[PDB]
Structure formats: C-alpha cells, structure tokens
Design a protein around this ligand. Structure first.
Ligand SMILES: Nc1ncnc2c1ncn2[C@@H]1O[C@H](CO)[C@@H](NC(=O)[C@@H](N)CO)[C@H]1O
Ligand SMILES: Nc1ncnc2c1ncn2[C@@H]1O[C@H](CO)[C@@H](NC(=O)[C@@H](N)CO)[C@H]1O
Lengths: 136, 136
C-alpha cells in the first residue's frame, strides 16, 4: 500500500464519468475544511495487516497535525504494483473501518472507481506533504 | 524518474520555509490558468537519456491535451529511490531545457528545495491524472 499524506486547508471532489464499468460506490461530491487528504493506492498483497498498519499511521500523523478530518481518497497512481479493483475497493473499505477504531474525528472515504475532479489547498509546513508505504 | 501528470484548470504555489540549507533556487510564488502540472521525482541514475524521454512524453501528452502551459513541480514523494538533491536539481534544470526543445508553450519550473503551499483544481476527465516512469 502506498499513501500520500496532504495536509489541506480545504479539499473538494466531484465524481465525473465512471472509470470501471459498474463503479461500486455511488456518484457524488463533497467538500471539506482543514483535513488530512490521504491519496491511497492499494497494492497487490495488501492484506489485513497492511490495513492495520496504515490505519494506525494515519491516526498517529493526524494526531500530531491536530487534524480532526481525514479524507481517504482512492488513487491509482502512486504505485506500479496495483491490486485489482475489486480487491482495492475491499481494502479501502477496511482501511476506512480500521481508521475509525484508531482516530476520533471525521473519516470520509471518497467514491472508488469514478473519475473525479478535485481541488486542494495544501499547506506548506514541513509535515504537510509526506509519503508512506505499508506491506505485510 | 517518476512523474505525475495533473491537468489543471488552475495552479498556484508559494514558497514557505526552506527544506534544504541553501535552496538553489530563489524563493517566490506563481499562479496559472489551465496547465499540465507535472509533479517530478528525480530518481538515482536518472541521466540525460531519462531527461529526453520524459521531455518528449510531457510534450506529446501536452499536445494531445491541447495545453499551452506546463509546470515542472519538483516533488520528493513519488518514489523510494530518490536522487540526491544536487543531482535532482540538475536533472530538473535539464528537463526544463529539454522540454523547450519539444513543446512550444509556457514552461515554468517551480523553485527546488523550498517547502511550498500550493492549490490545484484538477480536471476529472479520463486523461487528467496519469503517472509515468522513465529510466535509462
Ligand atoms: N489499486 C487501486 N488503489 C486505489 N484506487 C484504485 C485502485 N485500482 C483502481 N482504483 C480506482 O479506480 C479508478 C480507475 O482506476 C481510480 N481513479 C483514480 O485513481 C482517479 N482519482 C485518478 O485517475 C480509483 O478510484
Ligand atoms: N529527488 C528529488 N526529486 C524532486 N525533488 C526533490 C528531490 N530531492 C529533493 N527535492 C526537493 O527538495 C525538497 C525537500 O526534499 C522537496 N520538496 C517537496 O517535495 C515539497 N513540494 C513537498 O514536500 C523538493 O523541492
């Protein structure tokens, strides 16, 4: 699993056209104030262990940043070892649930498999932009 | 070399605090209308060949998108095989020059080694977000 952590002043996205056949999530759109935006690429052989490590790390980083909102944003582009879409969707769902056990604020998982426009205003402090890798 | 191609409606950045010791570029800030934003991670053993492949690909993608502005945005986070900063700066400079030989519009290389805030409004069409890897 490869993550990009962007500490945002604001974030918004809107689903456009699908990028699968039947995307597994409904279309939709959402916008946020200050949040940690976590661009999330599920990799082959990401499993339950990987999910728990990533959840714990997002929680711990969020805690030090003092953010109360985390966006889990499915993203195909951070890796060249992708999990298949069906598995990736499932791991993203589990990540979202595992995060709620570890982090007390708002957790929003964006729709999987839709093309989306988005807008972010990313902070420029030293911890505002970080990458993480998790394996098992 | 690992690239992320974001086809933006608008992009802006502002340098905040440095992230090296003496950053090699001056501080500053800039904003743009529609552009291809190319987040660029220089990897160990990126050389002149790599630069020319990447330049040609950015040019060709830009051409099909019909964009007339390319932002080369130094980015440390897309890879786990980074080139050292001094080499990375040099390759980024060469990429910028090699791009001008291949693409006829505005080329802007953002300051290397500064922390920066930024804002992007990224399009949601099917080619708006792509990743590339180049080696030699
Ligand atoms: N292994 C994986 N990890 C995370 N997300 C994945 C995935 N495989 C498929 N996706 C999702 O399907 C859309 C098209 O591939 C993907 N869409 C996107 O990545 C857009 N935001 C940018 O192109 C994404 O929703
Ligand atoms: N191998 C490499 N490829 C591309 N850029 C590189 C680099 N090594 C160092 N940098 C630059 O130094 C800043 C801190 O590492 C980096 N700053 C950034 O990556 C911020 N935009 C986000 O943290 C970047 O300017």
């Amino acid at each position: 699993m490869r993550l990009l952590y962007l500490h945002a002043d604001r974030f918004e996205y809107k689903t456009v056209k699908p990028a699968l056949k039947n995307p597994p999530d409904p279309p939709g759109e959402a916008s946020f104030g200050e949040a940690l935006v976590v661009f999330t690429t599920v990799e082959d052989g990401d499993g339950p262990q990987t999910v728990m490590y990533a959840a714990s790390d997002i929680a711990s980083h969020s805690s030090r940043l003092k953010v109360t909102t985390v966006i889990l944003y499915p993203y195909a582009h951070l890796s060249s070892r992708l999990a298949k879409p069906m598995a990736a969707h499932k791991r993203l769902i589990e990540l979202e649930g595992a995060l709620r056990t570890k982090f007390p604020g708002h957790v929003h998982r964006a729709p999987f498999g839709w093309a989306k426009s988005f807008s972010i205003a990313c902070k420029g402090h030293p911890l505002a932009e970080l990458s993480r890798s998790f394996t098992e």
